[PDB]
């Protein structure tokens, strides 16, 4: 959310979604602090953070 000058309430600009893996150790690191899902990692499951 962001605040616009001269206006109350927070104008929502977007929604961040995080992904979970059953086995995070199976991810293939490709450098730059990034991972790619492999067979051992499992199917990525998405959702809103803080829930599910």
């Amino acid at each position: 959310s962001v605040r616009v000058r001269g206006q109350q309430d927070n104008q929502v600009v977007g929604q961040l979604t995080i992904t979970d893996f059953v086995n995070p150790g199976g991810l293939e690191p490709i450098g730059q602090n990034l991972y790619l899902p492999t067979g051992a990692s499992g199917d990525p499951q998405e959702g809103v953070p803080g829930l599910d």
Binding site: R5, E28, P29, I30, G31, Q32, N33
Partner: protein, 268 residues
Amino acid sequence: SYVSLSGLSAAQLDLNTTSNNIANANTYGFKESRAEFADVYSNSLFTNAKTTPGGGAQASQVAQQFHEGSSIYTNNPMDLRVSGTGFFAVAKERLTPQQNELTRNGAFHLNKENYMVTANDEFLLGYQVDPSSGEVSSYEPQPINIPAEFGTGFLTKVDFDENGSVMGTYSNGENVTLGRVALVRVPNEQGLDKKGGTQWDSTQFSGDKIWGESNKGSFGTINNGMLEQSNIDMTQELVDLISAQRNFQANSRSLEVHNQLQQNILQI
């Protein structure tokens, strides 16, 4: 040994970034820098993928953290500060105001021509407003001139309101608005490339300069009689100096072990 040397380089870069911050603890308008690192992972078609030791620690980018610095009070009407988001426009040559740079410190004064210039004899840019009109008429930035005589009457006091307008009262008791300081903002401040003298220039990654007035739109307010010190914290930098020294020693110990392995084989 190349994994350890990358670790030594990353820590040494962290020390230099912290040392640069500590060195500028008194420079006005300074914005601190933070060293960011990334991982290295190189694999081939013919390289085993299950066992993937890292390649070390790569330097990602030295940031330019742009949080607001604290204000020091000087009681000088020519010392200015931006309270909020926005930069001053400063041109090296008076004739061409397009070749301008962004700055955050406001140690200004008047030259022999009574132009509002910085410490580096560089001209501050502002909007041209008519003495009788209100808001900006022509939006093209021009150097701000405070005439000694307007009428006639001689310049006596100069003050800046929250709108950035420089107003001069003269001996004839005639208050005339001489213009308002132009405020510049970019969508990506961290994308600006750093010149000398705590000044920045617009880049491809920093978006386009947004010309605007103070206390308008997304711009902050302009305060005279104030200056912005460095936005660094001495406590944070000293502790960060400690952590990178511990990190440097650990990586050099790893380099020492790797050498003693090769010495051990060399004696078979």
